[PDB]
Write a protein that binds this ligand. Structure first.
Ligand SMILES: NC(=O)C1=CN([C@@H]2O[C@H](COP(=O)(O)OP(=O)(O)OC[C@H]3O[C@@H](n4cnc5c(N)ncnc54)[C@H](OP(=O)(O)O)[C@@H]3O)[C@@H](O)[C@H]2O)C=CC1
Ligand code: SF4
Ligand code: SF4
Ligand code: SF4
Ligand SMILES: [Zn+2]
Lengths: 310, 117, 181, 136, 140, 317, 114, 123, 239, 123
């Protein structure tokens, strides 16, 4: 959103690198929510196997940024800094085994008859009121509608990366489960295509009036010391305007509506969270279900509650 | 060392703890707050406590005064303050000091005094 | 089948050795499955604070930006070259319907065309009066499509779908989820 | 591995004295190399054995029976967590930082009466008047 | 017994809860320490405030703290749980659960590393070493 | 906004000579300037007392005996207000060290029952001896000493005897001690009261929030020095009267033999000098100053239609 | 992890009181007062971080031109009181003293990438 | 003028005790820029007890006044007045001060002295 | 066929460039044709509903219809139901206050046509007291959004079942996302030990909030910028 | 959310002053019918006529408001307050927001005159 307001373009390597770290974020999200759904329904081994793959990925986060859980890596000019020295050879070594670590989790749930009977006609949403409730992502594609943002309105080097999209047919919790189990596979396809097709070049945007010069430069260049001093006290200024920018989070379509005064503070920011519209839609679906099947439907709208209230 | 506790009570601390640091006893700023000042203000919460495991980390105003003065033969003296074993840009920004007046002119980032000879 | 099953000696995982592997190929569901544990001499050696690549690193750049002499910044600045929101009231759309356009000027009498501009800028004409005054092929040229149809809600890049249904799909037939590409 | 053979051969390599202390310290049985020791006194070990998982190669044997992660020396702490390859006795004269003062190593004194006290580094911002009278 | 069995009622309402679920993960295991989440305050020894505390939930956090049986401790996980944190200057936030519950160990970190949360647990077990429930009855 | 209600003013000087400028508005994040030491702040009175004391930002120094209980008084004050420090009454440097920076100090150390280490003579007249020694030593304005009602030395009751002995001791040592005698004390979950139960003695019960309020209202004006106060509720009560109020809200020798058997336990058993105090009743000094000295008045201790509407609901689906 | 104020070779405090770490901090954890000392050099009289409102973004370390404050990888410093968790100048100078051997290893591998 | 102070949720204390000031920000004597000198700022006068005090502990600037950091921008002066009496606030308004136009020539610097020079330019 | 004899990939010939070549181009140039398309589409919509559409703005790939409050239900109905529009999915609706205007709040509506893959915005206005009419008649997903716009801004939606507060304290007096409401608020919470409950008190901070907005630029930072209005949709200069 | 809550009302704005007076009196009746379930529900110290005098007092705060729209916004806020109180969503700690006066005496030294306001400079 700030890139669109600022009218700047991120470099090539900065696009591919945010495609890649937006897909291992997708793997981590689908991992956490699929195994959390399986735990509150009652299967508890996938919780722990998925959380070990989450440890394997959180180290990649700690290599890349500083902190494991909260990384300030993706910045409005681009990327915070360059990859460490040998990580591209490491995500490959991870992916080679994650391909089978996922089929293994798939086997005790996909054709488990208890897991089937618990979610087959639970949480059915018709395709016409999936639009009226404002549902998106895995809940809209659970109902048969072929829509996702990284194919329809593409951004950040998803043009350059080839993949397919899973879309369910009946509006239930089972097809919302199956499309996540397939989005795992598609994200792994992104990861290996992005490790193969990684280019060289700058990782931040080119100019030092919206993000900082490197510390090699600002310790000898007068211009760069001026720009470094001013981007941190005052900040850069954004041109006056308004934008609504929506991307596809793994929870669904997540957007931000930001109003820029022309100052260096946003005049207004608003987060459109997917899970807000998913939990607002809860009454419409959970009418006439039993009390245990009011719990399996929480685990398909995947409420993390950082989304729902802020 | 006995200091008056706002009431005529004198409280007693060892004199190794009334020094600003074990380098320098006196204070190096006009609003530096003497250790006798600090202990006079709040000793309600240094009770039952060891003064030994307080930090005591070694005032730099006298660690810079014992460094030798560098001598430059030219007119202007260059400074970055980097190391040259470290792979990267460390130290401060590179500044150029005029050495023309009598005496030693110090770097305003690091304090290393330079003199023309 | 480009991403199909690969055997487990290209998967970088500690696996097994000896006749215990001959036992676990008989006692398995799929024999080409890893054990999960990465190979210790391969996975993360050397440790990230000990890299020979860190002492050779220099900050990256593209050519027409890092260029020392020929670019000035005002040619490659685009934050100050932002476009503004084209705000159109109804009376400028009446002005576009009655006076014309810069592609299509229906204005002679330049000296009198300023005062012909003026009364619409004052609010002499109204907008439905402009829709009634205006020709039918200006209604079918600028307001509507040249065939007389309403313009469809525009999209930037249209997406034509192609359902993959053979065994290049992600689920075989019988599963209630389809690959859409 | 999770084997009995591994705990078997490691118990035989390390010996029964060291086995009882490693059983009273950790649950595992580990055979190391003694890369070096701490200024606090904490022996460190690296295991080259083939059936080890990632993040098990390096470990500490402490000194005290109440042990902390806080009791490890800083240069060793980065090594135990797999930051550096070369242990801080293995690194040469050029990496050791120049100092003009002694090193003393306080671990952590939380709950201990040697816990840290915060205070005001400077004096109150507005002065008051010293009372001076005058007989007219 | 109070150390080797160690049951963490969690009142964590945001992000630090996933960082707690990495203490349940197979890399940093907690059951190998004796830790299990009895998810009812009637049986948990201790509470973990792992996340923020808003003004809408401060009596709810107090009511969950009220129900636990008397040998009770609480550790404060995160920086939003001690002194407000990132959301310190906000209208709907409690500036740390120190105002609500009497907390024994503070684990700092905005995502306080699973390493560090376990270290705070070891610090709490060291506090359990010197509780002296029976020497105190001897009027030491 | 908030306001300093405990203070008459902003700028307060104490009699020792310390100048105290209170800062800000009232409430949690501001400071009055006083430093207070409340002995026995673990206690049933002292919890309410330093809750009311640390409410406005008075720095409260509490010496504790056990550290597991004291945690419930960290909530009451701002960050930096309450200061816990360990104390035994035996180690006299802990007593003269906890009172070293106090400009007011409160004792409440009094125990119902003798145990292996303390009789009533060492808790009530010798601990008060040592604390008043310290206040004697350290030039502390406003020593406040809390006692029992029925506190006289000619009493047969060893509790009442040694508490009168205790005030003898603290008038002996510090002439400027305020000395305060409250009535029976009713409050929330009190030890030998409402939860112990929910008879011809007559004594007044007083609510404990208003003895804490009255105590703090003593604490800050120096009209209150070298005067002894008795704090009794509005209306005089019989025990059978009290317990039958409680009832519709919701031989002596072998009874003493029974309490003999039941004291040898870790739970707080009934003291034998307590039935002794039951026959004694509330005779209060008329040459003392009660609640209306310090401007407060204490709180006093005191089928056919749903069947047919049920006939329209649904009960089996 | 926790914070540290480093020192130069031959012992000088590095903090030239430029207020950049205070100006950038997203949670307003830094507070600094600065005075000219006896040498005429510009130093902090008072440096302070509230670790209860710190969020570990690393902007304070990214911002400093001298590279005076850094983040040590210590996360094992969990406390029992809030007063212990307010780090003044002296605790952070003691930290930059203690962890300096380690921060050598960190900044030998980070400084090109910064 | 409709009285919105009862439906804003703001307390009565703010509308009855606090006086507020509308002002246009002065051009700084420091630098030659004039960009922050167009909007009309709305700003609360301080309370003398509640403004700021230094802490016991570290010396943090503590405050009980809560409108000390709030400041509004308006396009117009009549915008600020309409909003200020619409919310029911006591306001003072400060009139701006622009610079007097004086004609400058560069040839002013060296005009001919007929009598005493009475000045020596430098350039 | 072993994990002993697997190849390493750290010992490999890697990609190496002498020099990277990235051409520079304005990011707004890729939008222009579609922006022209958007202009034409909007000029149709204003011509189709002249009673209800006061204006429109096209910035760059984003259409905004400026519509009056009593005009919102006839417009949204059109946007839901015309075969050309089909803006089925409600996305996000909220308010923004400009305190310098007579009508303080503007209420923005975001819509997605998943058929034609297009977004639209609808802006109306509201004073603090006067309402906007609710579109929860048409969209069942809208009301929670309206309700959030109620609590943060105080904007009303007439004809709304269960308008009340959401994502704020129950006894909270005030509307937070509003320029007269201060950042830290009016009240704070603590545990009173005397009453054995939490009490709500007037606010007081141990460290006061320091905004560094005082100290912004004194030079105006960005120009006016250029236009991407097509030559089809601006007024002809005479002669 | 097509089904609404139990004690809901579709928010509707009155063009007449008197029909809003009708709705206001109906609302007062709902509040005072619900005073005993408020006393049982929130476990209060006191008795029901103090809830009833607070409901009457909170209505006599807003009696001489003229403008019909401000009375509409007031009526909507009041019905939302009733719906929160009757449905047991508010808790006792926020139910007792309404009674700051009743819980305790806050202490001595209530400043009334100029001088005892001056001695603590309004504190
Ligand atoms: N019926 C009543 O309640 C009456 C009470 N009083 C008197 O008021 C005072 C407090 O009463 P109350 O609050 O109700 O009951 P308490 O339970 O508070 O009395 C004991 C208090 O003093 C501490 N204490 C007792 N002995 C010692 C000791 N040797 N060393 C250190 N501390 C000790 C206790 O510590 P700890 O908390 O660890 O147990 C506790 O804090 C007493 O003096 C009592 O005689 C006056 C009239 C009647
Ligand atoms: S402490 Fe940090 S990670 Fe945890 S909930 Fe708060 S802000 Fe989120
Ligand atoms: S630590 Fe760095 S940013 Fe902070 S005042 Fe010192 S030099 Fe400036
Ligand atoms: S890490 Fe971030 S929050 Fe913490 S002091 Fe540095 S800039 Fe501030
Ligand atoms: Zn230098």
């Amino acid at each position: 959103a700030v890139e669109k307001l600022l009218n700047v373009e991120v470099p090539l390597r900065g696009k591919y690198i945010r495609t890649m770290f937006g897909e291992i974020t997708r793997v981590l999200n689908h991992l956490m929510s699929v195994c959390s759904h399986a735990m509150d329904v009652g299967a508890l081994t996938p919780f722990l196997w998925g959380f070990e793959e989450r440890e394997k990925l959180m180290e990649f986060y700690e290599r890349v940024s500083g902190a494991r859980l909260h990384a300030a890596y993706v910045r409005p000019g681009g990327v915070s800094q360059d990859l460490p020295a040998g990580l591209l050879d490491d995500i490959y070594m991870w992916a080679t085994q994650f391909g089978d670590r996922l089929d293994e989790i798939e086997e005790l749930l996909t054709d488990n008859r208890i897991w089937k009977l618990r979610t087959v006609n639970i949480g059915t949403v018709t395709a016409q009121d999936a639009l009226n409730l404002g549902l998106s992502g895995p809940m809209l594609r659970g109902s048969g509608i072929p829509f996702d943002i990284r194919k329809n309105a593409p951004y950040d080097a998803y043009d350059k990366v080839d993949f397919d999209v899973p879309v369910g047919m009946n509006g239930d919790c089972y097809d919302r489960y199956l499309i996540r189990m397939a989005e795992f596979r598609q994200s792994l396809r992104i990861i290996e295509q992005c490790c193969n097709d990684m280019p060289a070049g700058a990782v931040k945007v080119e100019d030092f009036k919206i993000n900082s010069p490197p510390r090699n430069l600002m310790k000898e260049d007068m211009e760069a010391l001026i720009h470094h001093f001013l981007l941190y006290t005052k900040g850069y200024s954004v041109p006056p305007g308004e934008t609504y920018t929506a991307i596809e989070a793994p929870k669904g379509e997540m957007g931000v509506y930001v109003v820029s005064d022309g100052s260096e503070r946003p005049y207004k920011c608003k987060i459109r969270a997917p899970g807000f519209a998913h939990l607002g839609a809860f009454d419409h679906i959970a009418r006439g279900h039993f009390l245990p099947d009011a719990v399996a439907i929480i685990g398909t709208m995947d409420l993390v509650f950082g989304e729902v209230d802020r | 060392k006995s200091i008056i506790s706002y009431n005529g009570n004198t409280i007693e601390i060892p004199e190794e703890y009334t020094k600003q640091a074990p380098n320098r006893d006196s204070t190096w700023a006009p609003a530096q707050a003497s250790k006798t000042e600090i202990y006079k203000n709040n000793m309600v919460r240094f009770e039952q406590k060891d003064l030994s495991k307080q930090p005591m980390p070694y005032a730099g105003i006298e660690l810079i005064a014992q460094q030798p003065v560098r001598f430059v033969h030219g007119n202007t003296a260059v400074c970055d303050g980097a190391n040259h074993n470290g792979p990267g840009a460390q130290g401060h920004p590179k500044i150029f000091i005029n050495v023309d007046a009598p005496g030693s002119h110090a770097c305003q980032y690091c304090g290393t005094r330079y003199e023309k000879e | 089948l480009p991403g199909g099953p690969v055997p487990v000696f290209k998967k970088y995982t500690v696996g097994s050795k000896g006749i215990w592997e001959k036992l676990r190929v008989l006692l398995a569901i799929a024999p080409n499955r890893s054990t999960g544990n990465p190979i210790v001499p391969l996975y993360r050696v050397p440790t990230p604070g000990s890299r020979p690549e860190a002492n050779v690193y220099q900050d990256p750049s593209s050519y027409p930006t890092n260029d020392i002499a020929e670019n000035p910044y005002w040619k490659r600045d685009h934050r100050r070259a932002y476009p503004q929101t084209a705000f159109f009231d109804q009376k400028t759309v009446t002005g576009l319907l009655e006076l014309g356009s810069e592609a299509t000027p229906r204005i002679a009498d330049g000296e009198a065309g300023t005062k012909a501009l003026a009364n619409i800028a004052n609010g002499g004409v109204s907008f439905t009066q402009a829709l009634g005054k205006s020709s039918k092929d200006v209604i079918y040229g600028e307001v509507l499509t040249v065939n007389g149809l309403p313009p469809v809600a525009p999209t930037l890049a249209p997406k034509q779908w192609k359902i993959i249904e053979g065994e290049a799909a992600i689920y075989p037939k019988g599963y209630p989820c389809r690959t859409f590409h | 591995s999770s084997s009995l053979y591994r705990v078997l051969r490691n118990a035989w390599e390390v010996g029964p004295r060291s086995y009882w202390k490693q059983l009273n310290s950790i649950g595992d049985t580990k055979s190391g190399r003694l890369v070096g020791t701490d200024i606090y006194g904490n022996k460190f070990y690296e295991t080259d054995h083939q059936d080890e998982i990632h993040l098990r190669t390096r470990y500490v044997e402490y000194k005290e029976k109440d042990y902390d992660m806080s009791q490890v020396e800083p240069g060793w702490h980065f090594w135990l967590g797999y930051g550096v390859d070369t242990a801080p006795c293995n690194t040469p004269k050029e990496k050791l930082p120049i100092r003009a003062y002694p090193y003393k190593f306080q671990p952590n004194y939380t709950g201990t009466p040697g816990a840290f006290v915060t205070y005001n580094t400077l004096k109150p911002k507005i002065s008051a008047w010293e009372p001076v009278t005058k007989q007219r | 017994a109070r150390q080797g069995s160690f049951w963490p009622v969690t009142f964590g309402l945001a992000c630090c809860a996933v960082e707690m679920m990495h203490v349940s993960a197979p890399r940093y295991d907690q059951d190998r320490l004796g830790i299990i989440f009895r998810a009812s305050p009637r049986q948990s020894d201790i509470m973990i405030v792992a996340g923020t505390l808003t003004n809408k939930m401060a009596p709810v956090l107090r009511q969950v703290y009220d129900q636990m049986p008397e040998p009770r401790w609480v550790i404060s996980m995160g920086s939003c749980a001690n002194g407000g944190g990132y959301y310190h200057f906000s209208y709907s936030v409690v500036r740390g659960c120190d105002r609500i519950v009497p907390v024994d160990v503070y684990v700092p970190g905005c995502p306080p590393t699973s390493e560090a949360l376990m270290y705070g647990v070891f610090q709490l077990q060291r506090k359990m070493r010197n509780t002296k429930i029976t020497r105190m009855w001897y009027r030491k | 906004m908030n306001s300093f209600e405990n203070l008459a003013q902003d700028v307060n000087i104490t009699r020792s000579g310390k100048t105290l400028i209170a800062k800000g508005t009232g409430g949690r994040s501001s400071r009055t300037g006083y430093t207070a030491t409340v002995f026995g702040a673990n206690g049933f009175l002292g919890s309410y007392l330093t809750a009311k004391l640390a409410k406005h930002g008075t720095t409260v120094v509490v010496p504790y005996r056990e550290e597991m209980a004291k945690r419930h008084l960290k909530v009451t004050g701002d960050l930096g207000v309450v200061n816990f420090l360990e104390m035994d009454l035996r180690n006299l440097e802990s007593i003269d060290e906890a009172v070293r920076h106090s400009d007011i100090v409160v004792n409440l150390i009094g125990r119902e029952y003798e145990t292996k280490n303390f009789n009533y003579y060492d808790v009530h007249v010798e601990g008060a001896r040592r604390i008043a020694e310290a206040v004697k030593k350290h030039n502390i304005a406003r020593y406040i000493h809390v006692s029992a009602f029925n506190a006289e030395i000619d009493s047969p009751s060893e509790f009442n005897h040694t508490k009168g002995l205790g005030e003898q001791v603290t008038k002996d040592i510090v002439p400027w001690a305020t000395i305060v005698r409250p009535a029976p004390m009713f409050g929330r979950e009190d030890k030998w009261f409402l939860d112990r139960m929910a008879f011809q003695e007559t004594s007044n019960p007083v609510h404990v929030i208003d003895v804490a309020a009255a105590l703090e209202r003593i604490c800050f004006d120096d009209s209150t020095v070298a005067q002894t106060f008795e704090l009794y509720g509005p209306q005089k009560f019989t025990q059978k009267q009290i317990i039958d109020m409680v009832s519709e809200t919701l031989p002596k020798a072998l009874y003493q033999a029974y309490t003999k058997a039941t004291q040898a336990i870790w739970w707080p058993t009934y003291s034998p000098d307590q039935v002794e105090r039951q026959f004694l009743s509330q005779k209060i000094d008329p040459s003392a100053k009660t609640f209306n000295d310090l401007d407060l008045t204490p709180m006093e201790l005191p089928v056919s239609q749903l069947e047919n509407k049920e006939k329209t609901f649904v009960h089996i689906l | 992890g926790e914070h540290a104020l480093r020192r130069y070779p031959s012992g000088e405090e590095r903090c030239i009181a430029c207020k950049l770490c205070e100006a950038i901090c997203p949670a307003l954890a830094i507070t600094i007062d600065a005075e000219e000392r006896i040498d005429g050099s510009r130093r902090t009289t008072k440096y302070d971080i509230d670790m209860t409102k710190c969020i570990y973004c690393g902007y304070c370390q990214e911002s400093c031109p001298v590279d005076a404050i850094v983040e040590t990888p210590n996360v094992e410093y969990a406390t029992e009181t809030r007063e212990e968790l307010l780090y003044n100048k002296e605790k952070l100078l003691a930290n930059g003293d203690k962890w300096e051997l380690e921060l050598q290893y960190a900044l030998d591998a980070d400084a090109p990438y910064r | 003028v409709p009285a919105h102070e009862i439906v804003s949720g703001a307390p009565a204390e703010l509308s009855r005790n606090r006086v507020v000031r509308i002002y246009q920000q002065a051009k700084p004597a420091t630098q030659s820029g004039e960009y922050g000198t167009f909007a009309w700022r709305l700003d609360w006068d301080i309370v003398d007890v509640a403004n700021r005090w230094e802490n016991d502990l570290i010396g943090w600037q503590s405050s009980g006044d809560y409108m000390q950091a709030t400041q509004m921008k308006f396009t117009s002066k009549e915008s600020a007045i309409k909003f200020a009496n619409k919310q029911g606030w006591d306001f003072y308004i400060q009139e701006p001060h622009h610079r007097k136009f004086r004609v400058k020539q560069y040839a002013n610097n060296f005009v001919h002295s007929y009598g005493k020079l009475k000045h020596i330019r430098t350039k | 066929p072993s994990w002993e004899n697997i190849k390493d990939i750290r010992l490999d010939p890697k990609v190496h460039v002498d020099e990277v070549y990235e051409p520079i181009v304005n990011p707004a140039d890729r939008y222009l044709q579609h922006v022209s398309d958007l202009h034409q589409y909007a000029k149709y919509i204003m011509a189709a509903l002249p009673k209800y559409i006061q204006g429109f703005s096209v910035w760059k790939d984003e259409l905004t219809l400026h519509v009056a409050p009593s005009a919102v239900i006839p417009v949204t109905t059109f946007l839901r139901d015309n075969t050309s529009t089909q803006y089925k999915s409600i996305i996000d609706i909220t308010a923004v206050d400009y305190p310098s205007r007579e009508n303080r709040f503007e209420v923005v509506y975001n819509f997605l046509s998943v058929r034609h893959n297009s977004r639209i915005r609808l802006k109306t206005y509201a004073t603090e007291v006067t309402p906007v009419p609710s579109i929860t008649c048409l969209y069942e997903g809208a009301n929670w959004f309206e309700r959030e716009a109620y609590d943060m801004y105080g904007v009303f939606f007439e004809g709304h079942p269960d308008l009340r507060r959401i994502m704020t304290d129950y006894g909270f007096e005030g509307h937070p996302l509003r320029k007269d409401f201060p950042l830290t608020g009016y009240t704070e919470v603590r545990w009173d030990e005397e009453k054995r409950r939490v009490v709500y008190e007037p606010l007081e901070l141990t460290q006061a909030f320091r905004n560094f907005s005082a100290g912004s630029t004194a030079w105006e930072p960005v120009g006016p910028g250029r236009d991407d209005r097509p030559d089809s949709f601006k007024l002809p200069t005479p002669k | 959310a097509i089904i609404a809550t139990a004690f809901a009302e579709t928010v509707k704005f009155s063009g007449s002053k008197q029909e809003l007076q009708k709705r206001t009196l109906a609302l007062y009746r709902q509040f005072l019918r619900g005073a005993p379930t408020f006393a049982d529900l929130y476990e209060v110290q006191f008795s029901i006529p103090t809830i009833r005098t607070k409901i009457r007092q909170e209505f006599e705060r807003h009696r001489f408001v003229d403008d019909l729209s401000i009375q509409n916004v007031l009526y909507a806020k009041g019905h939302m307050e009733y719906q929160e109180c009757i449905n047991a969503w508010k808790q006792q700690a926020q139910f007792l927001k309404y009674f700051p006066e009743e819980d305790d005496i806050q202490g001595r030294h209530q400043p009334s005159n100029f001088v005892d306001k001056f001695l603590k400079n309004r504190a």
